[PDB]
Symmetry: C2
Subunit: 453 residues, 2 copies
């Protein structure tokens, strides 16, 4: 057993929203056994000094595109709207791949770096949505991301993605990226069989993740609806990015939500990325259907899209999680940092009603329990007996946090660095003193850097 002793603040996000001061967390294998003051060290083989730290459930990034780690801070993509951006990303990746510079082996190392960054940022679970499958067969890109994740020990969901609707029939994408629906479906069956760990504390899970309504055939959505029910896995896609509604109207004469409903995706198996601009009238429908939403403040701002109606979602009882999206539209994997963006950027939308603004605790909740609920993980996102020992802690005693009165608010509103001090995943200590304990930081940086096209 591992005991973390004397934590300055513990934020549980349990059913009573308990917080604790000068308290401990006891860990046994993959699970938390207790959270409380003065815990017994009866069967403890390692005690860790938590004094001066705040502990949270591990952050859960409910929407990544790991392969975009290779596409950060490209000058031509700095100030572009969505259409120019998407063309630029697809063209570059197709180009690099054609030149033998962007195969699964490269993606493995890009994923390794972004996932290691994730750990160092206090993120203990990542859900990646990979759609890049050039060629006549589905290559081992997902396997590569899973290999990277398992090597590091980070908890991992892979939402296999695609672009199955070609520009020829209304899609905004070139037929290079277009796979036949059956190829995608066949591949997903194999991935579930090979990799999916459905048991509590499972470390790898597969989800089914079409790129979206403007990008994938209705047939794929329906196939995935059937597959998700048959294999009890979850469903993920992009949702109400601006312009989606125009494309859905043109192709189908219905809204993106009506499309999802029609093809089996109005269900509690589903989590939806962005949800920036839904018709206000559909929000109660999202609630009744039990879909979950991941707030992605950084890309929404970066693309000029604006502010998703998160307060409205919370008012409606809709599950809200948080994510970063890929590093071509962020351009980092810093989830904690993005929370500050949301905390501040939402405010000018309601200048005279501060009670509507998202709070630090609401945001931290989204990034832990909310994201856990998005991923369908009742075993994560909460520091309590019986849940997974996924824990992230930050030091409170730096010169840049002097004068902080509330440590949880302080974690979002102050600081020069979002680097976690101590990070535990599945009961395994992976970060200590802001450094990886098992991963070779310098070698990983060197190896991945050598592979960036």
């Amino acid at each position: 057993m591992i005991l973390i002793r004397g934590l300055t603040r513990v934020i549980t996000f349990d059913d009573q929203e308990r917080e604790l001061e000068d308290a401990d967390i006891l860990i046994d294998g993959p699970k938390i056994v207790a959270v409380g003051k003065d815990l017994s060290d009866r069967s403890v083989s390692r005690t860790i000094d938590g004094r001066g730290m705040i502990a949270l459930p591990g952050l859960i990034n409910s929407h990544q595109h790991l392969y975009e780690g290779a596409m950060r801070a490209i000058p031509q993509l700095e100030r572009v709207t969505m259409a120019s951006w998407l063309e630029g990303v697809l063209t570059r990746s197709a180009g690099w791949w054609r030149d033998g510079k962007f195969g699964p082996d490269v993606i493995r190392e890009v994923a390794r770096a972004v996932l290691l960054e994730s750990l160092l940022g206090g993120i203990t679970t990542v859900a990646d949505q990979h759609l890049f499958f050039p060629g006549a067969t589905a290559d081992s890109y997902i396997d590569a991301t899973i290999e990277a994740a398992t090597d590091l020990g980070i908890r991992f969901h892979a939402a296999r993605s695609s672009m199955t609707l070609g520009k020829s029939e209304g899609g905004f994408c070139d037929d290079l990226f277009v796979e036949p629906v059956d190829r995608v479906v066949q591949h997903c069956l194999g991935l579930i069989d090979q990799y999916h760990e459905p048991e509590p504390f499972g470390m790898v899970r597969i989800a089914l993740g079409p790129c979206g309504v403007p990008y994938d055939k209705p047939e794929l959505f329906e196939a995935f609806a059937q597959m998700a029910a048959d294999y009890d896995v979850r469903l993920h896609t992009h949702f109400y990015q601006p312009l989606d509604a125009g494309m859905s109207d043109h192709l189908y004469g219905m809204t993106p939500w009506r499309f999802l409903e029609k093809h089996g995706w109005a269900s509690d198996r589903v989590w939806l990325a962005h949800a920036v601009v839904p018709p206000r009238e559909e929000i109660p429908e999202f609630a009744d259907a039990g879909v979950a939403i991941a707030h992605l403040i950084a890309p929404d701002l970066r693309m000029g899209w604006g502010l998703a109606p998160i307060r409205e979602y919370l008012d409606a009882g809709i599950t809200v999680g948080f994510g970063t999206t890929g590093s071509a539209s962020n351009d980092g994997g810093n989830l904690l940092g993005d929370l500050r963006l949301a905390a501040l950027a939402h405010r000018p939308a309601d200048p005279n009603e501060p009670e509507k603004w998202l709070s630090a605790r609401e945001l931290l909740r989204m990034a832990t329990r909310g994201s856990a609920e998005c991923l369908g993980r009742p075993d994560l996102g909460v520091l309590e007996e019986g849940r997974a020992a996924d824990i992230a802690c930050w030091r409170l005693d730096g010169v840049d946090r002097v004068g902080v009165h509330d440590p949880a608010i302080g974690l979002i509103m102050t600081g020069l660095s979002d680097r976690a001090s101590l990070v535990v995943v599945n009961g395994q200590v992976l970060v200590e003193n802001e450094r990886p304990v098992l991963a070779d930081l310098e070698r990983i940086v060197a190896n991945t850097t050598a592979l960036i096209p």
Copy 2:
């Protein structure tokens, strides 16, 4: 002499916006001797390895309220409008002060912490506007802040502030903080005499900083305009916060700008904080007058105020700098971090015109050369021969910056941490390997923390 050799990237912000790759910076005493490739280590007594770093001019925070470091992350002040905010801050400060908990000795140590954080964030010059002068006689609060700055070796401007218009006569300021105009003028003359270093590379400078049009008598603005001419010092105040226009109309029947023009402040001696909501038709007048503007994205968002027309200011040729404001409305002193906030938050105002969005380079210029210009420092903000050796460097080779293609954009758009690697002020190395060279960080944290009310 000191040679920084082999910097991966150097951003000069010189008159041709030169950048250099794999280049050196040579320093002699307080000044830069040369910037370029393979510089001679002739009289060099020390060579610093710059490989893997990006170098910029030191960041210059053109608007601080250091004493607010003690008022961070207060739950009751997390989500409040300006009115409630001002109420909460003035009550706490006056209340702590009355109880002997907020004297110059406390402010000295709060300033010491925030200024040390500033150095660690790559900030080499700070302009503080101390707003708390309880009792008719302003204590040695300004002396306290200067003492802290000089102990640390950070370059420092102290804008002596005031609240000369009391509510006892149609003003908005409590009588506890209201000083007779001549008393303020006299304190200012005493400060210039004791502290002001007008020579190039001067490390302490005095500025004259009324709280604002709603808060100070016309006679003070005029007296200051006179002092500014007499002593070649600069003038600083708050400008076009929401509600100012109404307060100005109510008291004087004219706009805040019209009022400044009337009382001698429409000149190239002036820099103005926020400038969030000016009438568009006055912008050309700002340009003609030659006033400079400090953009403060964090408090503007935190208060729910929204987006200052920065693109318009740049279009008009108006000098634009950057600052954080005080830590009661931020709540950090992390200037680099705030640049990312600006980079993203401005975009949704112009969804379809990305050319209007502020670029990384425009924002970094604001935080260096722009801020130097605000402060009237032609000796700062540029990495070139003859300017001050104020330099801030960040490492580029961390796992969180793998895949970055343009290091300057990457400084804004990526990272778990804004901590600077190497910081030089006045030719003195003050931060190296992300650690203070001379300052005792642990002792400073302990001492200041003990004094937080």
